[PDB]
Symmetry: C2
Subunit: 355 residues, 2 copies
């Protein structure tokens, strides 16, 4: 009767089958440790492996239908359980991240990585973007960036990119069953909450739905207590600040909300159809050759350019503690045309190639 | 290919919607996909891990939505499973008695015992379907199948059908039910899979008061020609309980309540009415009960337990609530030797096929 067993997992599942469910946020934390234990230790092709996948499937599905996995305390407890299997970065004694939950069913351009690179070219900003390929096509092996090498890179880089799978081994254990399940689970909303560097003190966290946003705001406050945080939801169904129509922002100011519109940044609206992803190789070429090269300017109404510039502007106003969106657009524009943003990126690529 | 993981997944997504978009006929179609997929899982390959993941997910989502506890869904699910079953063909009062299980109890096989005693009462024919106990009495139960039941039918007052030899569908889901460890729709299908259409009365035990009324309606959809008692013992028992009260649901809707005192019997704790496994259960039934060693008034718990369940069968067969007359007829069936001969005629009938 070991605690890390199918029998314990099963007892947690049965709490979720109750009317009403009797699974606490604490219980979810414990269930996830059990799941990660079972799946880390599962003997390939054992009967036990088929039984474990059965029970893990059962548990995660039951969680999704109860919808308890979209409540702040549950999301936070789930993030903390996954982090117990993560390599966290240890650093000595303004630093921003930008990332979305995914799940908006939108195949739009990688604006988060782009805006993270342009923001890092602005004097006074440091960007430690966490997520996940785009940045791997540029000529650096992202597998080299891990808990033991991030401290080497930290002092001399305005821009850093952390590929999630090389930190969160717990996510790696559930990867295959997540593919088999083919349905959303608690895991689909945890990514933005797993930042392995405690020194990040400001972030933009995009969410796919209006309903999730207020609970996500409360979860972000529990996981990143020291952080000033924008939760963002584009009204067309987007986990970023949208190039068309309005975006709502939930403001964690250690709950105030305000609406964003491209007209506020001094930009024309652009359909999502004009901001498509072309896949990592081509997106990287667009970013480096169309955007970081300074080929396009504010006022050309290039949609992907405008999309990056706006998301940089928000990242900048967040950093400076004001809502002067046009000033953010000025600063993002300057970081591109001064060649600072491309220098920031190239410095990080060169740093990574030296490991 | 419609019978694919992708088809299964699309049904699961209907259960995840608010509100759920999975119809009763959708559940029927989902279960056919599941029975198809689970036959392909002969090894612990990645493809079996994937399929087991999607079947678990679908059955778990169905449980949480509680659609599997609705009459129309239970009926459609029984219909889907039956598509993989051997059905008995017979030419143009016949009773069954069986419980859903899943009450967490380990009580004597009263349903097979009362089926035998009832089969010794003139005018009653019993075709009990379930499951071993009869297997241990020098009877090759494998020989009782779709081809042989029509040969045994005419000159047997008692017949026993071993469910697993008829319902190949239930065979394919057996491993994943053990692995899941939670109740699913499959926990309530056994009683609704009787392969002989001619059965026109039955007692169907359920484990759950909450499930009971919806199960009564399911029974009426699956067995529209049957007068049916659904029974639930208040202690949590899919039988007419030898202790405390039992609630009975009646379909041609109607509810009444049973208590051992109404049979002029004493109450016995479930500890006194325990199962000993098939071999010893069969020996108690043959040597202590069908032999007439015990009488009404001996207060022998297994004997009383069997008398009560036989009395209810008898009252159902005749359409009255004269429970003490039921006792009299059950007692007469045992002590006349009618019950033992009825069983012995079946066992020899099977032995000689």
């Amino acid at each position: 009767h070991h605690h890390m067993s199918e029998a314990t997992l099963l007892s947690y599942t049965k709490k979720l089958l109750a009317s009403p469910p009797q699974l606490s946020s604490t219980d979810l934390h414990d269930a996830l440790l059990v799941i990660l234990s079972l799946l880390q230790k599962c003997d390939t092709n054992s009967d036990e492996s088929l039984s474990i996948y059965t029970k893990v499937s059962s548990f995660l599905t039951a969680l999704r239908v109860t919808k308890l996995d979209h409540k702040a305390e549950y999301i936070a407890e789930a993030a903390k359980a996954v982090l117990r299997h993560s390599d966290l970065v240890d650093l000595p004694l303004v630093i921003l991240d930008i990332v979305g939950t995914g799940g908006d069913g939108q195949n739009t351009f990688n604006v988060s990585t782009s805006a993270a690179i342009v923001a890092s070219g602005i004097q006074g900003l440091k960007i430690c973007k966490h997520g996940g390929d785009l940045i791997g096509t540029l000529g650096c092996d992202m597998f080299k960036v891990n808990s033991s090498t991030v401290p080497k890179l930290w002092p001399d880089n305005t821009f850093m990119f952390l590929l999630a799978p090389f930190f969160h081994h717990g996510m790696g254990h559930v990867s295959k069953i997540r593919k088999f399940l083919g349905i959303p689970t608690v895991f689909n909303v945890l990514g933005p909450l797993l930042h392995p560097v405690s020194h990040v003190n400001k972030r933009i966290l995009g969410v796919y739905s209006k309903e999730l946003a207020p609970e996500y705001a409360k979860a972000a406050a529990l996981v990143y207590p020291g952080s000033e945080t924008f939760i963002v939801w584009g009204h067309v169904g987007l986990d970023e600040v949208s190039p068309i129509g309005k975006t709502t922002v939930w403001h964690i100011d250690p709950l105030k909300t305000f609406q964003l519109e491209p007209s506020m940044f001094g930009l024309e609206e652009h359909e999502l159809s004009k901001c498509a992803s072309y896949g990592p190789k081509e997106n990287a070429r667009i970013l480096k050759e169309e955007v970081l090269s300074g080929k396009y300017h504010l006022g050309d109404n290039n949609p992907i350019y405008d999309y990056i510039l706006m998301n940089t502007a928000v990242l900048y106003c967040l950093s400076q503690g004001h809502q002067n969106w046009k000033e953010g657009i000025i600063k993002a524009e300057e970081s591109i045309h001064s060649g600072n943003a491309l220098r920031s990126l190239e410095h990080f690529i060169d740093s990574v190639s030296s490991l």
